[PDB]
């Protein structure tokens, strides 16, 4: 909500810190004719973004 | 003196880290507007009234 650029509707706040994005917040879903599919953000196997 | 700081890369990587426009809008009501795509859209800062 805070660190989304203002054009995408967010506040676009600049962060001089260390804020972790929980992995559960990097998943979305899309509905196509075959059904509803789910996507994650990164193939990288690292800590939370 | 010119512009002594560039935020293009910072905002680029902030959009990238959040999973991109797709994930960011998944966090929002964008898919609830049934807009076919995110390209040909614009905001309006204030209403007519």
């Amino acid at each position: 909500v805070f660190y989304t650029p203002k054009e995408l509707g967010g506040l676009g706040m600049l962060s001089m810190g260390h804020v972790l994005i929980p992995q559960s917040d990097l998943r979305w879903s899309k509905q196509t004719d075959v059904g509803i599919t789910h996507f994650r953000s990164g193939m990288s196997h690292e800590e939370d973004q | 003196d010119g512009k002594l700081w560039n935020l293009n890369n910072y905002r680029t990587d902030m959009i990238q880290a959040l999973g991109g426009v797709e994930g960011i809008l998944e966090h929002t009501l964008f898919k609830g507007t049934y807009f076919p795509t995110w390209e040909g859209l614009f905001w309006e800062k204030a209403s007519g009234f």
Binding site: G17, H18, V19, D48 | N9
Partner: peptide, 22 residues
């Protein structure tokens, strides 16, 4: 995952300031 901002003192000293910028 708390949503609070963490102080980066004692953190990310493996990175410079001129990195991630062209």
């Amino acid at each position: 995952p708390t949503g609070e901002v963490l102080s980066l003192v004692g953190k990310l000293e493996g990175t410079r300031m001129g990195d991630k910028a062209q």
